[PDB]
Amino acid sequence: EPESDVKGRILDAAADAFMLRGFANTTIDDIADDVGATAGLIYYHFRSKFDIFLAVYEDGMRRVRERVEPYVGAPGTGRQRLVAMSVAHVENLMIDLGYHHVVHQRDQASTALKVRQRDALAALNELRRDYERMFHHVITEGIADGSLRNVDDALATRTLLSNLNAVDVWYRKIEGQTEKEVHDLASQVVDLLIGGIGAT
Amino acid sequence: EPESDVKGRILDAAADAFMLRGFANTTIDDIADDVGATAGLIYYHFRSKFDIFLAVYEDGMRRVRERVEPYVGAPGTGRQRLVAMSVAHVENLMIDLGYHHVVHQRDQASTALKVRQRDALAALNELRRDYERMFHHVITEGIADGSLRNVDDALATRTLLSNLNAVDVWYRKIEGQTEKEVHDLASQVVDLLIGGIGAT
Ligand SMILES: Nc1ncnc2c1ncn2[C@@H]1O[C@@H]2COP(=O)(O)O[C@H]2[C@H]1O
Ligand SMILES: Nc1ncnc2c1ncn2[C@@H]1O[C@@H]2COP(=O)(O)O[C@H]2[C@H]1O
C-alpha cells in the first residue's frame, strides 16, 4: 500500500475518532485499532496525536477550499455565487463530517505544544480566516449588486457562516445515502438560509 | 444577604467560569474567588461542581422559557409568533450568555455521576426538548397558514434552532451595551434567519 494511502486512512480514522470521543479522550491505540495496525505504524507517520489533529485540519481545509473556491470569482451575481459556495460548503461538511469537526474544534492546556505545532496551528487558523473571507467578499458583492438584501455585510457573513457550520448540530452520516441525496439535503438547507423561512 | 441571592451570585459566577474555561478545568476555588468567598460557602449551597452545572442548566431553561413561552399561543400568524419567539431566544442568549453555554454544553466520563444527578440531567434534557418543540409547533402552524414558506417543517425547525443558538459562535457581551442595543442586534439576526439574505 502506498504510504500516502496509509496516511489517508489514518487521517480518516482519526477524524472520526476525534469527532466521536473528543481529542482529549482519543488515544493513538484507538486510531491504530481503526486502521488495523499497531501504535508503531501510527507513530511512523505522525509523531503525536496533536500532529494527527494538525494533519486532519490541513486536509479538511484543502478539501473545502477546493470545493468552494472555484465559485468565488466565477460569473454570476453575488447571490448565485453565494448559493453555489454555500451548497458546496455544506456538502463538504456532510461528506467529510469528521474533518469538519476538527477544523472547527484551548489556549490553557495541561502540556505545552511543540514550537513547530504552534506555528502550524496559527497558519491553519489564518487559512480558515482566508476561507471565510471568501464568503464576506461575495456577500458584499451581492449586497452591492442587489441580488442580496441591503443588510449589514459583516453581520450577514458571521451569521451565514455560523449557520452553514451549525448543520453539524443535527446531521449524521447515513450509510448508503447517495451523493445526490446528500447534495439535495445540502441544497434544502441552503435554500432556508438564503431564501429565509418567511413567505413572500 | 438572602441565601437565594447568594445562590444566584454563585450560579452567575459558575456560568461565566464554565463558559470561559470549560466545565472540566473550572474548579470550586474559581467559583469561590469570583463571588468573594471560600470553597466552604460554595459547598454549603451546592455539594459538587456538577450540582452547580445542573442548577445553572435549570435556571437557564426557566429564564428562556419565561421569555419565549408567552408568544407560542398568542394571537398572530405562525411567522409573527416565530419572530417574537426567536428574538426573545436570541436576546436571552445575549443577556445570559454563560447560562446559554451550559444549557447547550459526554456519556463516557472519568467518574460516575451520582444517581440523583443522572436523573436531574435527564429531566433537564427533556425540558430542553419540550422548549425546542414550541418552535416546531409554531413552524408547522406557519407553514399551514401560509405565513412561512412551504418547506419541510422538521428540517426548518432543526435549522432555525441551530441558527438561533449559533449566535454564540461570534457574540460576546460588551459592557455598557444597552438593553435596546442588545434587543436590536437580536432583531437584526432574526431578520436574516426568517427573511433570508437573498433579495425579493
Ligand atoms: N444524513 C441525513 N439525512 C437526512 N436527515 C438527517 C440526516 N442526519 C440527520 N438527519 C435528521 O436530523 C434528525 C436529528 O434527530 P433524529 O435522529 O431523530 O432524526 C434526524 C433526521 O430527521
Ligand atoms: N455584543 C455585540 N454587539 C455588536 N457586535 C458584536 C457583539 N459581539 C460580537 N460582535 C461582532 O462579532 C465580531 C466577532 O469578531 P470581532 O471581535 O472582530 O468583532 C465582533 C463584532 O463585529
CATH assignment of the domain containing A40 = 1.10.10.60
In a domain, B171, yes or no: yes
CATH assignment at residue B151: 1.10.357.10
Partner A contacted by B193 (CB < 8 A): yes
Let me know if B155 is exposed, middle or buried by CB neighbors in 10 A (0-12, 13-18, 19+): middle
Q: CA B182 to CA A130: how far, in whole Å?
A: 29
Do A69 and A33 lie in a common domain? no
> What is d(CA B52, CA B54) in angstroms, rounded to the nearest whole number?
5
| Residue B195 contacts A where some CB pair is shorter than 8 Å | yes
Can you give the length of chain A in residues? 200
Q: Do B192 and A139 touch (CB under 8 A)?
A: no
Whether chain B has a CB inside 8 Å of the CB on A184: the answer is no
User: Are A85 and A64 a contacting pair, CB within 8 Å?
Assistant: no
CA gap B172, B19 in Å, rounded: 11
Question: What resolution does the deposited structure have, in angstroms?
Answer: 1.4
- Report which secondary-structure segment, H or E, holds A74: none
| Domains of chain B: total | 1
- Residue A115 burial by Cβ neighbours in a 10 Å radius (0-12, 13-18, 19+): exposed
What residues of chain A lie within 8 A of the CB of B167, using their CB? 159, 162
Residue by residue, DSSP assigns chain B as --HHHHHHHHHHHHHHHHHHH-TTT--HHHHHHHHTS-HHHHHHH-SSHHHHHHHHHHHHHHHHHHHHGGGTTSSS-HHHHHHHHHHHHHHHHHHSHHHHHHHH---S-SSPPPHHHHHHHHHHHHHHHHHHHHHHHHHHHHHHHTSB-S--HHHHHHHHHHHHHGGGGT----TT--HHHHHHHHHHHHHHHHH-SB--
β-strand partners of A198? B148
C-alpha cell at B66: 419565561
Q: Are residues A25 and A54 in the same domain?
A: no
Q: How was this structure determined?
A: X-ray
3-class secondary-structure state, position A198: strand
Instruction: Tell me, using a 6 A CB cutoff, whether residue B151 lines ligand 1.
Output: no
Query: CA dist A98 to A11, A69, A102, B133, Å?
Result: 10, 21, 7, 28
C-alpha distances (whole Å) from A57 to each of A15, A62, A65, A108, A126 are 9, 9, 12, 20, 12
Q: Find how far residue A110's CA is from the centre of its chain.
A: 26
Rounded to an integer, what distance in angstroms lies between the CA atom of residue A121 and that of residue A124?
5
CB atoms within 10 A of CB B4: 8
Q: Give the H/E segment covering residue A117.
A: helix A115-145
Ligand 2, atom 9, lies closest to the CA of: B171
Residue the block writes with cell 418552535:
B135
Q: Using alpha carbons only, how large is chain A's radius of gyration in Å?
A: 19
Distance from the Cα of B106 to chain A's closest Cα (Å) equals 8
Q: Which of A187, A68, A80 is nearest to B198 (CA)?
A: A80
**For residue A23, what is its C-alpha cell?**
481529542
Q: Which of B147, B165, B23, B4 is nearest to B77 (CA)?
A: B147
- For B101, the domain range is 63-105+118-195
Quick one: A94 and A113 in the same domain? yes
Report chain B residues whose CB lies below 8 A from the CB of A159. Answer: 163, 167, 189, 192-193
- Residues B148 and B138: their CA atoms lie apart, in Å, by 10
